[PDB]
Amino acid sequence: DPVKPSRGPLVTCTCESPHCKGPTCRGAWCTVVLVREEGRHPQEHRGCGNLHRELCRGRPTEFVNHYCCDSHLCNHNVSLVLEATQPPSEQPGTDGQ
Numbered sequence: 001d002p003v004k005p006s007r008g009p010l011v012t013c014t015c016e017s018p019h020c021k022g023p024t025c026r027g028a029w030c031t032v033v034l035v036r037e038e039g040r041h042p043q044e045h046r047g048c049g050n051l052h053r054e055l056c057r058g059r060p061t062e063f064v065n066h067y068c069c070d071s072h073l074c075n076h077n078v079s080l081v082l083e084a085t086q087p088p089s090e091q092p093g094t095d096g097q
Helices: none
Strands: 011-014 024-027 030-035 043-048 065-069
Touching: 011 030, 024 043
Parallel strands: none
Antiparallel strands: 011 024, 011 043, 030 043, 030 065
């Protein structure tokens, strides 16, 4: 369907199983999203939001850390531990669920 290719302003971000199937992506911006454990396991999926603005506003999940930043390689060193102030790499704010 006629959709803006990666929305337009291409921000590349380290991708890890989120919007990309392995490596990296040029997209809309950098969006990180941890699939919080609750029995399962916290998987830190980061990369280009591309066309998904949902990951920068909140999906029907609540306890999912959907962080978005308009800077290249922002998900390269991001905090995905929305739960408590654990020790991440670059903590841009007090991680709290």
